[PDB]
Design a protein around this ligand. Structure first.
Ligand SMILES: CS(=O)(=O)NC(=O)[C@H]1CN(c2ncnc3[nH]c4cc(F)ccc4c23)CCO1
Length: 167
């Protein structure tokens, strides 16, 4: 039993809700919140900008030190950093950004990072400003993640579409 509330169950291990991931994180304080990161950990907009704003820019300060030490992430890769006031940990995962021409096949590699964590609160990778089809992203999630994932979808119209079209 965990504290996630109001989710629709899609599969044995995948759950979905129309929610603001920032508000969901502040209420649940999950062990892991996933950020929709880029390779530079520049949290300017989308999910990343919202998560970082909610940390009063502490996420960005920590991220800048990470990059200065380690260099950029790989597309499809991840790193574990602090969850600040939102979660114990933040798993920064880089999905491909279609608006940069990145290979959508890397989306599966991106979701594989979730399997290193037993339970996660996450957005749909490569959705939103990353330019991928969220219905495809949900399919890859379901077919790749084996650990327990709670997906927060900000847009109510999109949430209803994802549910209605789910196979
Ligand atoms: C690869 S992405 O990060 O750019 N994907 C997207 O942006 C998708 C999904 N986004 C979110 N999903 C869940 N919770 C969210 N809180 C937010 C707060 C914001 F100020 C902006 C977006 C979100 C958001 C919504 C917009 O479209």
């Amino acid at each position: 039993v965990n504290s996630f509330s109001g989710y629709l169950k899609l599969t044995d291990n995948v759950y979905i809700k129309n929610a603001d991931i920032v508000e969901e994180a502040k209420k649940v304080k999950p062990t892991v919140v996933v950020n929709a990161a880029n390779v530079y950990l520049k949290h300017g907009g989308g999910v990343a900008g919202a998560l970082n704003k909610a940390t009063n820019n502490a996420m960005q300060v920590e991220s800048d030190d990470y990059i200065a030490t380690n260099g950029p992430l790989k597309v499809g890769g991840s790193c574990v950093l602090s969850g600040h006031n939102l979660a114990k940990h933040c798993l920064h995962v880089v999905g491909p950004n279609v608006n940069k021409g990145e290979d959508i096949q890397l989306l599966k590699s991106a979701y594989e990072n979730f399997n290193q964590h037993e339970v996660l609160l996450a957005p749909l990778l490569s959705a939103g400003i990353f330019g991928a089809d969220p219905i495809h992203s949900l399919r890859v999630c379901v077919d790749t993640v084996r650990t327990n994932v709670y997906l927060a979808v900000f847009d109510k119209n999109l949430y209803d579409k994802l549910v209605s079209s789910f196979l």
